[PDB]
Amino acid sequence: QCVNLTTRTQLPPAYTNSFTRGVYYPDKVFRSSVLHS
Amino acid sequence: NGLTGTGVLTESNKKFLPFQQFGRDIADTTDAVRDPQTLEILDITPCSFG
Amino acid sequence: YLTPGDSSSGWTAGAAAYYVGYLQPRTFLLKYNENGTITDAVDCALDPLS
Ligand SMILES: *[C@@H]1O[C@H](CO)[C@@H](O[C@@H]2O[C@H](CO)[C@@H](O)[C@H](O)[C@H]2NC(C)=O)[C@H](O)[C@H]1NC(C)=O
Ligand SMILES: *[C@@H]1O[C@H](CO)[C@@H](O[C@@H]2O[C@H](CO)[C@@H](O)[C@H](O)[C@H]2NC(C)=O)[C@H](O)[C@H]1NC(C)=O
Ligand SMILES: *[C@@H]1O[C@H](CO)[C@@H](O)[C@H](O)[C@H]1NC(C)=O
Ligand SMILES: *[C@@H]1O[C@H](CO)[C@@H](O)[C@H](O)[C@H]1NC(C)=O
């Protein structure tokens, strides 16, 4: 069960801007009302 | 949980996310902790003052 | 029933989109509100303003 698909149209790649996306909590400590570098 | 210290423990209003156990202030000292048996948050305040 | 094909031309795609970007080592300045949530950040190498 393994196929090579077809009926696919050609197109160049597309790009977009990330408006301040992709930030995560860098530890498991609780912090409140602060600015941390 | 192995973290030793001295101070006064009081009931807290902070509310931890499930993956958090300790809370730290700007001087990086532990000022809040989740009790590992009752799952309640406590504030730790130093003892000397004045 | 609308995708005759055989098994390699009889398929419909659907609708979805996904975006990919790559991480690098940066210094950020995160802002925690009183509830402990990160609500804003500054990328310390984007501009001279930052
Ligand atoms: C799907 O297409 C690929 C080519 O894009 C086929 O690839 C070859 O596979 C054989 C083994 O079967 C290898 O010996 C060749 O070196 C491969 N060549 C390349 C360029 O990949 C693949 O067999 C196709 N599979 C199906 C089910 O159609
Ligand atoms: C840890 O064990 C203690 C008892 O050793 C449990 O405390 C009980 O908690 C329930 C609350 O649902 C009370 O009704 C009982 O009276 C408690 N027992 C005692 C002896 O105080 C505690 O629930 C245990 N930890 C967990 C996560 O269940
Ligand atoms: C992303 O990089 C490609 C590389 O050629 C460029 O064509 C495109 O304009 C860039 N997009 C933005 C938003 O800068
Ligand atoms: C957390 O702060 C938000 C505003 O930033 C507020 O709306 C919310 O009530 C607070 N959560 C509580 C009630 O602990």
How close A2 comes to chain C (CA, Å)? 10
The CA angle B33-B5-C32, to the nearest 5 degrees, is 35
Does residue B16 belong to the interface with chain C, where contact is any CB pair within 8 Å? yes
> A4: Cβ below 6 Å to ligand 1?
yes
**Ranges assigned E (strand) in chain B:** 8-11, 22-24, 30-34, 41-45
Which whole-number Å values give the CA distances from C4 to A1, A33, A37, C12, in the listed order?
A: 19, 60, 58, 10
Nearest to B5 by CA among B37, B32, B26: B32
Which whole-number Å values give the CA distances from B39 to B16, B31, B35, C49, in the listed order?
A: 10, 16, 5, 44
Task: Report the distance separating Cα B37 and Cα C45, nearest Å.
Answer: 44
Q: How many CB atoms lie within 10 A of CB B21?
A: 17
CB contact under 8 A, C32 and A31: yes
Q: Which two tokens stand for residue C3?
A: 């995708």
CB contact under 8 A, A30 and B19: no
Task: Report the distance separating Cα B43 and Cα A30, nearest Å.
Answer: 12
